[model samples]
Target: VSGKIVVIGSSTGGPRSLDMIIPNLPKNFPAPIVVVQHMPPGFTKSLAMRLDSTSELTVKEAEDGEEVKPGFVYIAPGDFHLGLKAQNGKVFFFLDKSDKINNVRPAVDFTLDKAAEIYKSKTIAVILTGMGKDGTKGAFKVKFYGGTVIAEDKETCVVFGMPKSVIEEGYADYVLPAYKIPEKLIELV
Candidate 1:
């Protein structure tokens, strides 16, 4: 299958859950995975390193202007918002130290919104367990652009506030357990 971009937003139990999902991806997964995991500075790097160690795909903190690559996962750095910018037929990471949105610098909404704008129907935005509605608007944006939106089911979420809001708002395309996300993504991408 052709590669696409997969953007995932998570919080409250992201690390533990991602541990299960990331490692399942093949080294030639055929997609670039961008992640926004709600966390403070210095933590995202460690999280990326942890994921990189076990996952078949390469995982690293996103760098400003760095081009997106298939078979890799780029994580938003803490204390900054990471978005995608399409230039010269390639997508690159745009890191900004903008004011926090929804009390988070690396807000899930910001990441998903940019991904939707850049990748349109080629994007797959997944909203996982979190405390608030950081990704609801972005989920709508993705849906508006003919993209997909997946939410963690309430029963499986560590904190259902975020995904619950999106699902309740009728924005979610798939509402599955956290463990099932990787397989679903494999099928999609």
Candidate 2:
């Protein structure tokens, strides 16, 4: 997973879902993981710190132009859409205040699209428990670019809407229970 990266998106009931997924990853997991979980500004700041405390990985609220690094988790700041810019074959993370997609500023679709363009087949997009269809189109972009997609199964989601959209649209490569996702990811690296 040295050259790969993971971009995740979730909404309603996302923090709880993330608790399950993040802590399961080993600190040495070979890719940088960037997350987009809907929340206001203050909340994302706390969630990043809390997630850092609970997981083996270093989790922090993303800062503009932060270099993507292995074994670190970047939580997209609230109120901003996370995007990536590739330079010299390396990607740097940045944020945008552009119009909200799916009515949300830090839209998962926004980050995933840029990741797909930069990482192509090396990008992995995970659609977890959430409301609305925010990740639907982005997951499609990942697939179109030959990347992989893992969608949480309905039984494991607090709200199945997000993952369901990608699944139904034939964007998902794996439809798995939340618990099962970690092993697959761990295996991927």
Candidate 3:
């Protein structure tokens, strides 16, 4: 867990849930975190700023080719699928404007699939409260790469569709409430 990468996908109630988890993260968190919150363009910038102000980790919108760093959180800007690539022992963001998958421009499936391919066993994918199955395929990709996939339990999710789909498909390795996610992530990362 010392140098793992954590990728989280959520929608609907994501902002509130993120606030609960991000602020509790330790300043010395051992991994870099990437987040896809199913937002529109203008909203992602504001969301990044909000998280940066409240969280111990450095939070900002992902920039193309920016190197990944520990104790930092990169939020995928809306309307683009933010993927990761490893080059010369370093990881950087690969922003793409490919056609939307699952009706989401910044599709979680695209990001998670790319992360799984690049990071393999060192990736941790989390699916939180969301209204659709946009994250289910991504969770499977992560699991296929021997990465762990965590889904917010149905009882805790505002919509439950995304997590429920992943859990039913047997892709989720762990299921927990939103408030408990940060602690679980800390243990894993």
Local accuracy by lDDT, each model: 0.87, 0.89, 0.88
**Clash count in backbone of candidate 1:** 0
Q: What are the per-residue Cα lDDT tens digits for candidate 1 across 4-117?
A: 788888999888778868898899988899889999788899999999999989999999989899989998998789978888788888888888898888998888888888
**Where does candidate 3 stray beyond 4 Å?**
none
What clash pairs does model 1 have? none
lDDT of 3 by residue, 1-189 (tens): 137888999998888778878889998998899999998777899889999999889999999999989989999998789988888888889889999897887988998998898889988999998898988999988998899999998767778888999999999989988889899998986
C-alpha RMSD (angstroms) for model 1: 1.7
TM-score of each: 0.95, 0.96, 0.96
TM-score of 2: 0.96
- Candidate ranking under lDDT, highest first, comes to 2, 3, 1
Segments in model 1 whose C-alpha atoms lie over 4 Å from true places: 1-3
C-alpha RMSD by candidate, in order: 1.7, 1.3, 1.4
